[PDB]
């Protein structure tokens, strides 16, 4: 579960996240009628003075049986037009993203490992 003011780990190779900076990114908005964010839910980060959209690809909170619980809250940065900012994702991504209602094929293409 991601909320407002949560601390997030960018799991791309994009410069926006990749570059080591003393502050992690923090969530400013969750794009849902429910304030909570789960796998496949977009969020608006505040990353290095910039406001950037992102997608949740994993979280530490338990989900339904047969789905993977991660140890960190993982997020990918997406451009305003919706194209991913980064070109590669080396961390495993759950396969549930494929069937959730939304646009996730672009992210899946960039992800080599699926869990």
């Amino acid at each position: 579960a991601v909320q407002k003011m949560t601390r997030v780990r960018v799991v791309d190779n994009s410069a926006l996240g990749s570059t080591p900076y003393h502050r992690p990114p923090r969530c400013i908005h969750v794009y849902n009628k429910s304030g909570v964010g789960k796998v496949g839910d977009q969020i608006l980060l505040a990353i290095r003075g910039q406001k950037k959209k992102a997608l949740i690809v994993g979280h530490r909170m338990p989900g339904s049986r047969m789905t993977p619980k991660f140890d960190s809250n993982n997020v990918v940065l997406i451009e305003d037009n919706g194209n991913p900012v980064g070109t590669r994702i080396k961390i495993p991504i759950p396969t549930s993203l494929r069937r959730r209602e939304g646009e996730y094929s672009k992210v899946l293409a960039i992800a080599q490992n699926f869990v």
Binding site: N81, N83, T87, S105, K106, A109, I110
Partner: protein
């Protein structure tokens, strides 16, 4: 997916036409029992992706194809040049 398809397009207009034609043919060409397919990336202006049941097609402009290099990743599963640059780390104290 069983098959991964990437095809370049001349311009944004051409990209929309190709996507619309394929979906129109897809519905006409049987698939009566099979469910429907969404068109993804319409908000995007240069990259459109349509995911059929067992095939995924990505249509994008030449520059977008060059930047993302989808062909290399799937051809070279773990030996992609961009992937190689992504290493791992740990967190030790500073002294």
């Amino acid at each position: 997916t069983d098959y991964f398809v990437i095809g370049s397009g001349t311009s944004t207009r051409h990209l929309h036409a190709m996507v619309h034609y394929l979906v129109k043919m897809y519905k006409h060409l049987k698939c009566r029992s099979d469910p429907y397919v969404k068109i993804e990336g319409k908000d995007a202006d240069d990259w459109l992706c349509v995911d059929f049941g067992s095939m995924v097609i990505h249509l994008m402009l030449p520059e977008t194809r060059e930047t993302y290099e989808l062909e290399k990743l799937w051809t070279l599963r773990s030996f992609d040049d961009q992937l190689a640059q992504i290493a791992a780390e740990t967190l030790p104290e500073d002294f």
